[PDB]
Amino acid sequence: PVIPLDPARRPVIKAQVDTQTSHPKTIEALLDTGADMTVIPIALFSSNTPLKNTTQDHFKLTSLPVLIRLPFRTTPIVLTSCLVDTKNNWAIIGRDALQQCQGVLYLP
Amino acid sequence: PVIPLDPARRPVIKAQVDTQTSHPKTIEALLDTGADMTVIPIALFSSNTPLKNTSVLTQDHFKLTSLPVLIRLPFRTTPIVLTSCLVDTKNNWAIIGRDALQQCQGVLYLP
Ligand SMILES: Nc1ccc(S(=O)(=O)N(Cc2ccccc2)[C@H]2CNC[C@@H]2N(Cc2ccccc2)S(=O)(=O)c2ccc(N)cc2)cc1
Numbered sequence: 011p012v013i014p015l016d017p018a019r020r021p022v023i024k025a026q027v028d029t030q031t032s033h034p035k036t037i038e039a040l041l042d043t044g045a046d047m048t049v050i051p052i053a054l055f056s057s058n059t060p061l062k063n064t065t066q067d068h069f070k071l072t073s074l075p076v077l078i079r080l081p082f083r084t085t086p087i088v089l090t091s092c093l094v095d096t097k098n099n100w101a102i103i104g105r106d107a108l109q110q111c112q113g114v115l116y117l118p
Numbered sequence: 119p120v121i122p123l124d125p126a127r128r129p130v131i132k133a134q135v136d137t138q139t140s141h142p143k144t145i146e147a148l149l150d151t152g153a154d155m156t157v158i159p160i161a162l163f164s165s166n167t168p169l170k171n172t173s174v175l176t177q178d179h180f181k182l183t184s185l186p187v188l189i190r191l192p193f194r195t196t197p198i199v200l201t202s203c204l205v206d207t208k209n210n211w212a213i214i215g216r217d218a219l220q221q222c223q224g225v226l227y228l229p
Pocket residue numbers: 042043044045046047049093102150151152153154155156157174175213215
């Protein structure tokens with residue numbers, strides 16, 4: 011699909027996230043071409059999972075790869091590692107995931 | 119033009135920005151679809167300024183333009199007229215927001 015760019019309406023998308031620490035959940039993420047690394051809410055991780063620390067406190071880093079499935083594509087997007095928002099339930103699809111699903115940016 | 123996305127490659131572009139308080143200048147701006155408002159450096163403005171204080175998701179980093187900003191892209195000849203945009207005072211980033219991408223009818227295509 012073609013997502014129009016609007017300052018009023020955020021270019022969001024419904025995406026299922028597999029953190030491999032809990033059951034796969036479908037969340038609303040933000041399509042961001044400015045973000046290099048995908049952001050995942052800490053609400054999708056188990057209480058046990060160890061995360062690599064790397065603003066230094068607001069975000070953490072995954073220890074295990076994360077699988078992301080879009081409404082249209084059947085095959086999941088594999089991310090070796092991605093940021094973990096531990097504060098504001100932030101889900102942001104960066105270029106690291108947008109590259110794997112042939113995503114581009116068009117300017118007439 | 120079709121701009122490919124890569125985590126190890128910032129989707130930057132060359133743009134001419136007119137702050138209407140100095141000489142028009144060319145800067146490297148980051149194509150950002152997660153930005154609802156364009157951010158430009160304070161190195162483009164003069165000394166006097168009058169810029170408004172603002173809060174951006176930080177109360178101290180960004181400032182708001184009192185006058186519109188003329189932004190010109192390589193391909194299209196007609197400029198993008200933002201009524202207002204953010205001014206980075208701490209660093210000197212250049213970020214093309216969705217407010218600018220809308221007027222040039224930019225879109226996000228996902229196969
Ligand atoms: N890897 C990585 C790098 C940066 C970020 S981000 O700063 O959180 N972040 C997402 C975001 C946060 C808060 C509100 C809206 C979007 C960036 C990504 N795109 C827009 C946003 N920004 C651009 C940016 C900043 C630093 C580095 C790279 C890009 S931004 O500065 O926060 C921003 C926020 C609001 C507006 N109007 C304009 C710009 C997230 C992950």
